[model samples]
Target: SLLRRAEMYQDYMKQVPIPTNRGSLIPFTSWVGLSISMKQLYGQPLHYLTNVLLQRWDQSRFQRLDSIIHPTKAEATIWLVEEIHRLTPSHLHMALLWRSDPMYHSFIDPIFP
Candidate 1:
């Protein structure tokens, strides 16, 4: 049952589209790649995390890192990455921490790394 669900979940994640508007801070391809990796590594729900992050961008209450008059896309993207890292839960940290660790790869390369 778990394997069956993961296959379907993986297929669904692969087909999910991302925003590609000029105003978008993060690129569409990057989000797709990250989502797929999240699925393969941790089986995270496809839309939940990304949707929450995108919704935050729409709210005025979540202030931008740059000045209102001169906000840059790169600045916004960096801030979004920071926020996403902050929002990552304990279980999801396994892959993130593994990927980030230098010594683990030094000893032996992981299949995903």
Candidate 2:
């Protein structure tokens, strides 16, 4: 789901059908968080909504990322709260891991005073 996802990967999205909808794909064909293949359908309402948004991203050619994101000021914080939430888990993934920690907080106020 888009909410679960940190950033959208062009490579991952292209594998799915445009505007990814139902009836067109078999039960096996679905976005299992890995994109495309239609291996199966396994999400609730949230999943479908996120799926639609993913397709919307494609329709805009990825020119509408900020449209959904709220910006933040440098604000002297060590973190930016990460615009992408679906960051793949990895040892090197610091921002994401820190984002979840209570010790690591960030500001979301306007860049300007």
Candidate 3:
């Protein structure tokens, strides 16, 4: 039953085309907005996590890259602020929820300034 359900979901996902921004209510370009920011912020974390997971947890797919390089803290922090500014209004609205909320806001506020 579980396998059948999984197959059904896979088939549905395959058949359903992601709607393009112009043609759909939510534009496709919006997806790139978050991706660009996330890529900048978490690129290193992702690389490290991927290496640890695939090499240690699932070695069959692991591949050693030429080198693993990381950016300086200052560089990353600047990039993060720039990305936050570039975010769309809708994204800002969502972010502001966490930003304005007193408890969580303090954590991120210092990072921004």
Candidate 4:
């Protein structure tokens, strides 16, 4: 059930379609309303030991990419926060959340359906 729901969510999120295939959500860094300034325990966002699990991949090192399994496979990966490769005319430092974690599968239903 957890895996199925994630797939459905992914399909539904793409209904509108990004003209350049960028992503759905906004960047956490720029959005003060969502950015984690406090209430973040033990670098919680970076590491969690709840009934669920969460992890991250460092694209900064492409040479070791194999370690990342499947970068954005929802249920398999939970979530992906890929940066925007706008390939614009200038430097592109900005990045968006791209995909939010499949909480139910990663850290929810298994704990409490």
The best candidate in terms of lDDT: 1
Task: Tell me the tens digit of each residue's lDDT in model 1 across 30-96.
Answer: 3334334433444334333343443445454433333332333533453355345334434333345
lDDT of 3 by residue, 1-113 (tens): 43453344334333433222222111112222322344444441111112222233223323122122122332343334433333322433434444444453222212222
Runs with alpha carbons beyond 4 Å of true place in candidate 1: 25-113
Task: Name every residue pair that clashes in candidate 1.
Answer: none
lDDT of 4: 0.25
Off by over 4 Å in 4: 19-113
Give per-residue CA lDDT, model 4, range 1-113, as digits (tens).
43454444333333422233223232222111121321121122211221222222222233223233322232112222211111111111111121343343343222221
Model 2, 17-88: lDDT tens digits are 323343332222112222232222322112222344444444665222333332111111102111122222
Per-model TM values vs. the true structure: 0.27, 0.19, 0.21, 0.22
The number of residue pairs in model 4 that clash at the backbone is: 1
TM-score: which is higher, 1 or 4? Answer: 1
lDDT of 3 at 22: 28
Model 2 alpha-carbon drift over 4 Å, by segment: 1-34, 38-46, 62-113
Models ranked on TM-score: 1, 4, 3, 2
After superposition, the stretches of candidate 3 with alpha carbons farther than 4 Å from their true spots are 22-113
Each candidate: RMSD to true structure?
14.1, 17.1, 17.9, 15.6
lDDT (0-100) at residue 99 of candidate 4?
Answer: 31
